[PDB]
Amino acid sequence: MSCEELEIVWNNIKAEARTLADCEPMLASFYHATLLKHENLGSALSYMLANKLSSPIMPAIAIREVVEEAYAADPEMIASAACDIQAVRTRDPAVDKYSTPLLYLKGFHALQAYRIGHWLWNQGRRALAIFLQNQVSVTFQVDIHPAAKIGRGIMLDHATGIVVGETAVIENDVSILQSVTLGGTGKSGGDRHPKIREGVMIGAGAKILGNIEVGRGAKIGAGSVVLQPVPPHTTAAGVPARIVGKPDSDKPSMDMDQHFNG
Amino acid sequence: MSCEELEIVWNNIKAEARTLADCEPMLASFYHATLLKHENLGSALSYMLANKLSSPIMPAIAIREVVEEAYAADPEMIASAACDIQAVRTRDPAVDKYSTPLLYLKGFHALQAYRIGHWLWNQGRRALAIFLQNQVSVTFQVDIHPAAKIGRGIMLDHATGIVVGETAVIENDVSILQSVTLGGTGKSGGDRHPKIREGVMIGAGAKILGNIEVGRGAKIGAGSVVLQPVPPHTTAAGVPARIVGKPDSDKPSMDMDQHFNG
Amino acid sequence: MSCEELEIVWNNIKAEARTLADCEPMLASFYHATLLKHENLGSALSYMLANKLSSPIMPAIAIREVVEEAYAADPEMIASAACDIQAVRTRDPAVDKYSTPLLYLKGFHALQAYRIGHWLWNQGRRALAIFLQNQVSVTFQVDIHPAAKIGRGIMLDHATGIVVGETAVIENDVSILQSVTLGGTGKSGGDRHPKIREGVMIGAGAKILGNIEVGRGAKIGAGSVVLQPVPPHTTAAGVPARIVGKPDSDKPSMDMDQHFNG
Amino acid sequence: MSCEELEIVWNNIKAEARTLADCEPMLASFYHATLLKHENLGSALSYMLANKLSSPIMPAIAIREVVEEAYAADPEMIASAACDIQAVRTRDPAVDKYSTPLLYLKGFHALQAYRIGHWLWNQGRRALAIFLQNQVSVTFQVDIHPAAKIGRGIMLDHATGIVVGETAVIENDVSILQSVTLGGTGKSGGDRHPKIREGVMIGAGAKILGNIEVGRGAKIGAGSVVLQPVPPHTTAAGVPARIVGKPDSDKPSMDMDQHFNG
Amino acid sequence: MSCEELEIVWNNIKAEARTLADCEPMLASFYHATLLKHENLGSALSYMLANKLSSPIMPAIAIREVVEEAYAADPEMIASAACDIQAVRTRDPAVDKYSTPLLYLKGFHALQAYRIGHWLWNQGRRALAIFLQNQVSVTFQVDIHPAAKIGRGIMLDHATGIVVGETAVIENDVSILQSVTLGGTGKSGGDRHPKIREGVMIGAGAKILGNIEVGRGAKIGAGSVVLQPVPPHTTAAGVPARIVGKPDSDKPSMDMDQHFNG
Amino acid sequence: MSCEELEIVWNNIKAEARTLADCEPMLASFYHATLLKHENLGSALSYMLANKLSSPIMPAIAIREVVEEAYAADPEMIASAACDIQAVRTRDPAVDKYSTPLLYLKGFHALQAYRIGHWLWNQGRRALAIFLQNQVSVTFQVDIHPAAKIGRGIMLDHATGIVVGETAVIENDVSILQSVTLGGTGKSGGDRHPKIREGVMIGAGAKILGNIEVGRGAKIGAGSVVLQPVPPHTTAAGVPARIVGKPDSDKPSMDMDQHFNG
């Protein structure tokens, strides 16, 4: 995601937004406020997060300032958001616009919310990070610990019931569905959550528990319970999971083939 | 659901409401506003939908005109709601009143909200339909794509975590529990979601993926991951699912027998 | 939980609040209003529940009086909340403070909301109870029927998607994760939901269906579908689940070992 | 105001609305919802009243049914609003559009809210009428008792601080400014408030107290304190007021000449 | 106002509240929450103030606690409220119930709000007192400096535009109408506001400016500008005011005779 | 007002905020969000206006961008606000802090809201301006037409009931109290509202009507009705007003002597 490519995803969002105002006069001012009035993705993201997260405790106007402070300090979060937008648009056939994730999709919203909380956590502002984690769980039904380390090009399609714990890692170009847990084991601190490598697809309802590897290009079948490491470019399925095949592609996250004969 | 039988469902709802208002002074005014003031199920329904889906982006008062416009153009939607209410009351032992689904049950609300989104989608108002889909996902935790084709006499019991994709079909007299996915596969458009035929029961947490058929009178056991077509009058269970038996009834959606040995 | 132990968990929460106010100025007035201004747990709980259960139909101020009346009639509900705070702090390595469950964790909030609903249900105020049940489902994504009998020292970790039905029993010192169903079967009323005995641990996404026992100190593996009774001190896993071993502790709810194999 | 002339006021409002929506993207959706979606003045009016009077005690959606019920039973109220709109547009040089009073002018809103309160009062719904009176006083700063009898073609320009008591009469084609009191005297019931006849203009801050007559075509100067009857076609001014002259027009309410030397 | 008389005004409010729930089913839960559920006037007052004053800055639940703390420390404020209620009921013929001021009348609400701010001011909590003064000005359109000293048996009828400054004093049994200013002069601190003695009636729009006496039993005519002391049992009127008569009663505040021939 | 004087009033406001946070813990996060988190007046103003102008039609976050665009185009509006803060602090003995006008005083809030409306009005965004005009009237009870030309160093003390019309002019260093009308005459447009020149003081409830001059350093007595021009350095009072004397200062707006006689 280069500076020029960033400006193209933003230009495509704007172009679409013009169409949308003309399609739905009841949302025209909504499209104007969220998209058309903004000159870059960062301003559109801070607007969305501020309004979605908002509460009596913390108004949208206050939140936006924290968000904008995060993005000034680490503008790469904006670029990660762009890659997440492209991932949804290319991988999800129900989404044919760049603007749709930004406008509507709770998984995209929760992902960008996590990035703010993560930045806050790393700055030492943990109380606020933990508040936001739990507000995002109630509001968007996605529960991501702010100490998790999550890359870019991530799709959280549908997203309700996703849980990602404190020591999890998710690398770039990972596709995760509703009700996926990357969960802990034990009652002690320490490394205890999954390590999800690049290219991995995880079907709806998968539980992956403990400090275990899911290697690059692996496919986790829907409804699996994964208790042991999954080798790269392998397909795991069942309760508990065992290796049952190998994906037909190097990066199953890009193709979303939900079959697990293989 | 004839026009006479509709008026009897409505008359029962009102009769229940009077008793409810006399017993719970904190909710007397809520019962009056939602039920005792309306002269038909349609008005009560637009009321409930407008109030529950209300947001700063679109207020109750605006939502309601959209709902009433849809009901005027396709009054069968109101009949469909009435059947959905009877489905819940007869199939769910936790419900002993026609008023309960209408007042409180988020799966019932999500289902009627889907109906409005589907009507909008079909008229060409896709942008509003997609907005409402995702509003419904955040508020009721049910994510139903508005292009899904869903019949009547449907129960969505508990409902949190339900996902029904763009090309799904659900025929009449189907019962579905919490965390059920009628999900897609692949990254291209076109039919890629299940077709659930009449009489089918789907237990909690079942995942049915792809353009596969679940035949009439079939039972899908809780926690199943169904990747292949399920023949009529069969029971499927497992990760991945296989045919394990046959239901004791012609329409397992009616009796809610969660056992799978058949 | 005695009166002096109650007062100490409260003292701990207050001390933690002082620090929290000092280190996050955006939240200072929040910590002050939730924690610092109160002289006991009960008063902090009513505050939290009032604000979290608040809606157009019932504002915080009116809810609070209901909570306070319940707590004056049954002070053991405050003590049960204490035990639930301890349960979380000791069992959940993501949690290192007494105040965290109270301030933030929706499973803890939903559990205490259920207590109020259960109290109302046993007073004959069933309409109010069912209304709160379904509100808690929409707002915290936890659906517990107020006639469920649930003990103390309970953790609902993450919690999204939890469903507990009408005739369920959960005894003391039980740990339950996201997307756990204690669910029914059949369309007739009467006893039909699980009896989960003391010390049980239930992992993510487990469905336990019917009026079946899960014996003391049992362990239910993540993703299991339990259709048959599970003996005391035994581990069940699979779809459908079978006995696969015995836990390494007497009360697996306290240790949270998600491994099954043993 | 015939039924043909009403439709022309409405058609002009809609024509204005289209231009307004094209010029101000932040308000495009507001114009659409308030004006362009309605097919008559009555729907637009119930919309505006429901939204503006909305409170936690009574929401917009509930207010609107009350308003629409009143308009169905006494459609002349809608004609009265249409005349009040023409009054403002023709008499107030700051208004050059029929849409302006309906969209923005709190004196216009307060006056139509009075009409609903008066209808309720007359049917026997006094408790609701008194609630709305005082809600209107807090929200629009106009306090009109619902038993007041107020005709049509009335302008309440600026309107803050207007008080019209229980037994007041205001005939057709009267114009009243900010901080005008049509007030009582004494501590007993019965007629004790002014009777303002047709054509009368009342300047800012005038106080008219007791059951006294202000005759047709009379002008009351700004700041007057009128304790005694004012003859038709006369001008009164002073503290206390005396007859100082005679107006230049037959109906000073039409021309708004604030000068008092006559 | 004795302890027994306090219990009688409260009993009358309760009796009326029963009638009202039966008269208006849309407000029945409102009457239940505000009046019927409370066992004394103090609890009903703290409820009303908390909900009316409420804002994003300070929620109703937080405010109620401050209010209740004020009333514990100085229960005489409750008794003053009772006398203010009786004053409205006896002096205002538009009000025939004890409950009406408590439920609806913004002047009564602003008066009781001032008592809280005044208690706060005297405790040294001036920042909060000044915040509430200005919130009451926006919300109820009454602007009373918290350092003002105001007695009991006060009626603020209609109340919009009332201003009472920092060094004002208002004794018991005073009746003040809309748009009355008890105002300052100069830009220096020090005594500079009116001293209104017992029994005084002040008509709508009167301005009384500077540190001047309005002696017991005096009558200030509507629309007067009073720049010099008014002797006891005298009637002042005009701009500027001069003595023009003497009231027909010892305590013109009780009779509300608005005439000023005398 | 130079750039260094601006920065000092800001420094004063911040220092005052530190103290205010320390002494009222309920408001600490409030003071922090309004004052402490900002680096300049302009940014604190946009925050305050966004939050105070916020509504369902236009949320705080969108309003704020409008305010910021106005301030970037015309930075002198920030400097005018500074001057207005000083005006209040120096002229109003109830005010001893720079932060008080900014945090609390609705006249100061309404004045800066007018500045935004005036800027929008001169950009051709007249519909938005008129919408904000009428919102400010409902919310702060101040009705200023956005085409009014108003200078800097203005105090609107108390402010409820102020009306300023379309063609009014208010020059620098003018002081105006509650219930002042600068009002029009006639039903034709064109110039028809007062021209209030530098240094004028206008007391409570004065009405000044028509396109008439009120000359520099004049004093308008409370309750006056001014229908004829008022020479520079002259005092007008009465209904209707006449010249009664000459003020004791050059700019009576600075000294606030409400006496008239001289």
UniProtKB/Swiss-Prot annotation, chains A, B, C, D, E, F:
One of its GO terms (biological process) is response to X-ray. Coiled coil: none annotated. One of its GO terms (cellular component) is cysteine synthase complex. It holds the Pfam family Hexapep. It catalyses: L-serine + acetyl-CoA = O-acetyl-L-serine + CoA. Its EC number is 2.3.1.30. Keywords: Acyltransferase, Amino-acid biosynthesis, Cysteine biosynthesis, Cytoplasm, Repeat, Transferase. CDD domains: LbH_SAT (cd03354). It comes from the Bacteria. Pathway: Amino-acid biosynthesis; L-cysteine biosynthesis; L-cysteine from L-serine: step 1/2. It is found in: Cytoplasm. Its main location: cytoplasm. Sensitive to feedback inhibition by L-cysteine. InterPro entries: Hexapep, Hexapep_transf_CS, LbH_SAT, Ser_AcTrfase_N, Ser_AcTrfase_N_sf, Ser_O-AcTrfase, Serine_acetyltransferase, Trimer_LpxA-like_sf. It is an enzyme of class 2 (transferase). One of its GO terms (molecular function) is serine O-acetyltransferase activity. Homohexamer; dimer of a homotrimer. Forms a cysteine synthase complex with 2 copies of CysK. Belongs to the transferase hexapeptide repeat family. NCBIfam families: cysE (TIGR01172), EPS_EpsC (NF041874), PRK11132.1 (NF008349). This is Serine acetyltransferase.
